[PDB]
From a paper:
The sliding clamp plays a crucial role by encircling the DNA double helix and anchoring the polymerase to the template.
To obtain the structure of a one-polymerase complex that more closely aligns with the configuration observed in other B-family polymerase holoenzymes, we strategically disrupted key dimer interface residues. Three mutations (D75R, Q430E, and K432E) were incorporated into the gp43(exo-) polymerase to break two critical salt bridges (Asp75:Arg244 and Lys432:Asp118) and eliminate one hydrogen bond (Gln430:Glu127) within the dimer interface. Following successful expression and purification of this dimer-interface mutant, size exclusion chromatography demonstrated that the complexes assembled with the dimer-interface mutant polymerase exhibited delayed elution compared to those containing the gp43(exo-) polymerase. This elution shift indicated effective disruption of the polymerase dimer interface, yielding T4 holoenzyme complexes with only one polymerase. Cryo-EM analysis provided additional confirmation, with 2D class averages clearly showing the presence of only one polymerase. We subsequently determined the cryo-EM structure of this one-polymerase T4 holoenzyme at an overall resolution of 4.0 Å. The primer 3′-terminus occupies the polymerization active site, suggesting an active conformation, although the finger domain remains open in anticipation of an incoming nucleotide binding. This structure thus defines the canonical T4 polymerase holoenzyme architecture, in which a single polymerase associates with the sliding clamp that adopts a largely perpendicular orientation relative to the DNA. The resulting structure shows the clamp positioned perpendicular to the DNA, consistent with other B-family holoenzyme structures. This perpendicular arrangement allows the sliding clamp to move along the DNA on a thin film of water molecules known as the “water skating” mechanism.
Numbering used by the authors:
A (entry chain A): 1 to 898
B (entry chain D), C (entry chain E), D (entry chain B): 1 to 228
Amino acid sequence: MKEFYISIETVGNNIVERYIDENGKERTREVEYLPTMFRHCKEESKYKDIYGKNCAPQKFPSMKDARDWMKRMERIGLEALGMNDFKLAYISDTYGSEIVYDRKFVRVANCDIEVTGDKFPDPMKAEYEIDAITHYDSIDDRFYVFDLLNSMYGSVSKWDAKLAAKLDCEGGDEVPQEILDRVIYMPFDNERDMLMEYINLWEQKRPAIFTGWNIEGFAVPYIMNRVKMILGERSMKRFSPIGRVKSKLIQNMYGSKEIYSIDGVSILDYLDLYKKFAFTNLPSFSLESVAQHETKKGKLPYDGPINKLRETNHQRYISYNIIDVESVQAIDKIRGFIDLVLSMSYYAKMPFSGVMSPIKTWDAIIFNSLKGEHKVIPQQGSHVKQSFPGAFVFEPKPIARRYIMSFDLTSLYPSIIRQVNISPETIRGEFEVHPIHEYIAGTAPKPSDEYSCSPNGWMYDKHQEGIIPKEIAKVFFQRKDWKKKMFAEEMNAEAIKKIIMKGAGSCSTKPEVERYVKFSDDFLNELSNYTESVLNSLIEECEKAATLANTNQLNRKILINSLYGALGNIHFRYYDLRNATAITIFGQVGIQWIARKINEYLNKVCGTNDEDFIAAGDTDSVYVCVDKVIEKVGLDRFKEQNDLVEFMNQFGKKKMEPMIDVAYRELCDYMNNREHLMHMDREAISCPPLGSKGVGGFWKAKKRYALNVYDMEDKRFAEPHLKIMGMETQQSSTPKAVQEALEESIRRILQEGEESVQEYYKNFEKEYRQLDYKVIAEVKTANDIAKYDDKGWPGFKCPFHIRGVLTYRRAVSGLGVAPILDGNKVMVLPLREGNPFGDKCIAWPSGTELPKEIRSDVLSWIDHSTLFQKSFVKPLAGMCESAGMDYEEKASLDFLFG
Amino acid sequence: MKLSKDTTALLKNFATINSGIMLKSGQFIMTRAVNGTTYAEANISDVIDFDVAIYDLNGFLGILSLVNDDAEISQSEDGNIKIADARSTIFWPAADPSTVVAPNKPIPFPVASAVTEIKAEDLQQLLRVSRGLQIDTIAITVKEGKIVINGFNKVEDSALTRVKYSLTLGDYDGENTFNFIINMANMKMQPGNYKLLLWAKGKQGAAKFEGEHANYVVALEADSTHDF
Amino acid sequence: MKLSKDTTALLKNFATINSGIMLKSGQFIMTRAVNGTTYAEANISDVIDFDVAIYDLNGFLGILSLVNDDAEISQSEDGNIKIADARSTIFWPAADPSTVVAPNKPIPFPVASAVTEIKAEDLQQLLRVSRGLQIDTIAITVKEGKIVINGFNKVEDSALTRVKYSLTLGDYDGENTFNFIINMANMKMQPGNYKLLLWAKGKQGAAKFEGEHANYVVALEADSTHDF
Amino acid sequence: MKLSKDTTALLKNFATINSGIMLKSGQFIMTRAVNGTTYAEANISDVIDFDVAIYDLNGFLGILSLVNDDAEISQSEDGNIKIADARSTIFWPAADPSTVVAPNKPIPFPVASAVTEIKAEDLQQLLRVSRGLQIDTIAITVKEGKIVINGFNKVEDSALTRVKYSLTLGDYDGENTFNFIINMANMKMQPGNYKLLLWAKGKQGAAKFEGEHANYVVALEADSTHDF
DNA sequence: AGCTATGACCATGATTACGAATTGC
DNA sequence: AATTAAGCAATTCGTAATCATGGTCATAGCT
């Protein structure tokens, strides 16, 4: 096991690097690094710049010397190249080659502090004392739980594992016993010994990576503020490995955000991680809600103020803290995120925190690639942020389209980058720009035939590959290689499973298996002769290999999808506004071009004229309407729905797809792009059930559509499944019960027809009155209530949910319940006529419940009608009226006047 | 043509139901609404001699009230509408038949399933008070052997149960029982005595408020039930 | 019940004071400002036999004015209010007595420092001019031995030193001096001849307007001065 | 000094065109458009003793109407306007004459190229149709030897080629021909019988309406045609 | 005493801007 | 000391201001 870095920091003119050895022990060292940059030189040198101009190396004895040199160099306004951040240069020089890592050499720490008080524990105040602490260590896979017995806010008894393992009906806490099997209890009667023990455990068991649920929000700040106020400055300093803990208070407009960085340890939050890589937004962002969403695990429900729970049950208090840390670890295990960031950083050879910014990692990887080809990285130049035009979006006709075919480009932006061969160095010049509508109709002449052009009006170097396209090809090749490895391992696992279920052998010696390769049939026959234990060991090894391959491929996917956001940014090193504008403009041109071509071809085949068959779409995705083709052929010939589905599948795969491909070949011919790459694929098939008076699909506006999909990609669905997008169903704002009933209504309109919609509307009308008050509420989000907070009453231009928040704060100020702050989703409810609170809406933290003194008052004045019509009736009416349906049979004089 | 003030008021009501109109030669006027739930017909004292369609009747009636009644109205030389006064002349564009919703033909209302009479005062009270209490919908049904009406508020009572307004209508000697529900929005007849002819079959009936100056026809709601 | 149209007018003028009102049995009607600076009482010739509290007074008096005057009022079988005329019965909902600000008992207030009489038309004129000139406040005072009222605006003349309007009640019989400042948002009295009664002790003070039907009490402002 | 009811009405009419006004001593009242497109003047029977610039004239007439016509207007102690009544006193500030837009001297009207008369009913009906037909342009011309007025919507009909409205004023026995375009906003005259005079010199053109109380002068559009 | 016409008032609706919130490529 | 860090296009509701539109009680008028 080769040595690989764990953390890197700069102190003075020295780099402190903590890392792992050959046998797997975490140790640190200091290196007085020697910075080695490059400057422009007229004499020919091996290391040339981006454009080919020569660069002469320059060495300094210290980082400060190089920084001062750069200062006096920029003072004379002369260009000097190299890598500014000496940490990246040092870490690249130290390793250079690839890095192989193991998860048992990295210490992941999941901490959580539970503190009671009369008022919400403010990290700025740090007034109360931390009477419960949990710290899970990954390498020890051990929870360390420390409980304060005596406190000014209450004295409690000692916690028990057995009692915490008992059922609630038996007075227990239902904590899993396998957890307490990995739990070490250090109770303390006094806070002083508590703090000292935590500090020395931190110092002896120094975590390589620290993460937690909104850790930097409260966990880190409150602890550091408490130790600072109780033991001066040495307290916090000694927490850091090298006595370097720095305050980074981000005083926003609304409040303050104290940020503490422990230098030498990669302090990385986990709430931001779920808010960055998960791509799914929940009605709540509490730990309990996300835990219920990921691990289906529900903590024993509690009713009352959190602080008052300790005074009634300390056992359940500690149990809740333990289970919440356990849930954090569990959701990470099922999601696989910390390993993801670690893999990304090791692949790109940058400090762990560099995962937080795609600019950073792309800069590092490009630096590494250019160092591999012996080139010189240019310095960063100042710029000004400018909003270039974005992605063109169609305007669908809000008419329910029965038959829709979807088509899409795969990874549009990287394909554009590589196809057009664009890069900050490949710039050659600008051409006479023609009006865009000329290009969309293929009427404007060729801007140039010697350089690859872009309809933003530029020509860039031909023949020569661009560095960014080079790296795009590299990452694409690695991605497809990793996916083929994944497929091979999947086939191996399936073959071993079928062998085992057919029958196992009696060989108890585990043989050697090459990773990331497909097993041969002879190999499978050999493996069929082994014992069950060996087979299971091979299965788990294959599963772990598959997980690593999935991590690699998903990291590559994140990199490629993030490169587009990386390229357009002032702080980016290879930033070039013209390049990004070229990319987006070319995307718009291509999508509108193919839109016109599709309309032309569909008019040709269907025989009509000037018909807009292209339903809608945006960048890399166009949905067209093809019901006219079905009418041309006829619905009677299909005995079953699947017959229609397979017919339209064949029609999509064999009839127009070559036309799209040849249209894009003609496109790449018209342009001077290096290579045609815009592969278009059929995406999904939308059609109503045969014979049913359903509608099949509809839209409401741009980026708003509901399509009953029968076969997305090629994965044929036995029953059709709905792919609703943009509508109120996906929105978190809609209440959960309203969300589900609305989704059922949408399914009914898509599949059955109007009458089912009306019947279910009546059923929901008669049920909605008798529903739980928890599942009918808009959730929205409170941001800067202080901006609209004015003496317990709404201010000017006061947003609705903020008004409800103010009403709730009026209601429960002095009641000592959990208060509402920014970020916390606040479910709101409307109040009718004369409410005791004094306003029409009241808002409580999402997921939470109202304490019983106000529960009766709220349930006595819940305005069922207004909410029912402003959350469920109104969007339903919008959808149905966009689909030629009415939810309530109204009728007319058609019996007679007709 | 000369349109007497009573004809102007009747046209104003027919504008309230529908902002546009079409008319043919004669003395019989028929106007529908876009939603199709309302119909109206009448026989004005004056006579129309030329067919024409008007898009914005409100301004039309306003300007005709501005000018003398004797001032003649006719179709202009360009196909539009011209009105000549003793000293002035006005021109109004002609609405096309397609651009204004118009009723197809006179409606053959079948034999009435039930019949009653409402006096002007009671109808005026109902129309004036349904806004005060947000009485969205009305029901006409058989209570204690007499036909009566009662107001139900739909916005809060989808079940149609909470009795807020209730007015006695009159006797009804019939073994049949019915529960006709009508949207207040379609209740747009001009204040006056009316004879209710209510018909129903299958799932769609109608109500004919007939009066000396015009007859109005209102659709019934699906909630309306009947047993014969 | 059978409330005269004068009773309805009194109720309507009471609605502008407080959104809702209680109704105790008898001949006595009173209500008070939500902020408590204004209070109104009156004796009604019509007889009240049962108590009920209602929040939406304006709509209720409106619908009552809508119905025929012969109608009768009682409490519903569901705890609401029901009003029935010759042919129609209506059910106006009743309210939870908690919501309404219910004054517990009328203020007898026997003694006072100053007394005068203001005519109806002068009150009307000063109310109209206060509306026109945005006169937010007035002050009843004595100058040249004359009971007078002077109007000013706080939002512009914060010190209230520049007079924007003046009216003389008359001469002052006594020799005591005072200057009572009264916000104009309090003035809700029915337009009629009133007898003005001024009292003030230390910090607190009171201005009363007595009419043939109703009497009004308002509290002076914190800058009101008095020495007797 | 006192203002009679007719004077109040006339100044009310005059406020319709200009926000402010100058009140000069004597029996002459003057006003000019804020953009100077229209002019008006009148003679009263009340002797004026002082000049004062008035900015919020609509409020001034509103407050004047609320009091009796025998109220006296005087120069207040603080360089403003005082209204003294039998029992009420009002202080309305006087605006700065520099900021108030008004002519510095009366403008005599030269000889008229065209002479005719317009009845009060004609003015009323043309203003009403201008409101109803949302006209913006009026072309006064001579057709068949008759001085007439036609209405054209310049925004919709830039060529004024569609006579939506027309009205004949008089019989003109002259080879002189003209066609003058005027915007409606210039027309602010009070209803009444008037005499119309037209006077143009090449590009320059203007019209004048004379009545028994007040007179108006209106600017014309430069696109007007004329051969005299 | 009652229909007729006018009139500001007050309600209300329609518009339009703006900000806050949230997806989706 | 590191510069501190995806991009844009799109949709919907509430508020607010603001005007316009329209009943309506209020007011002047003739039968």
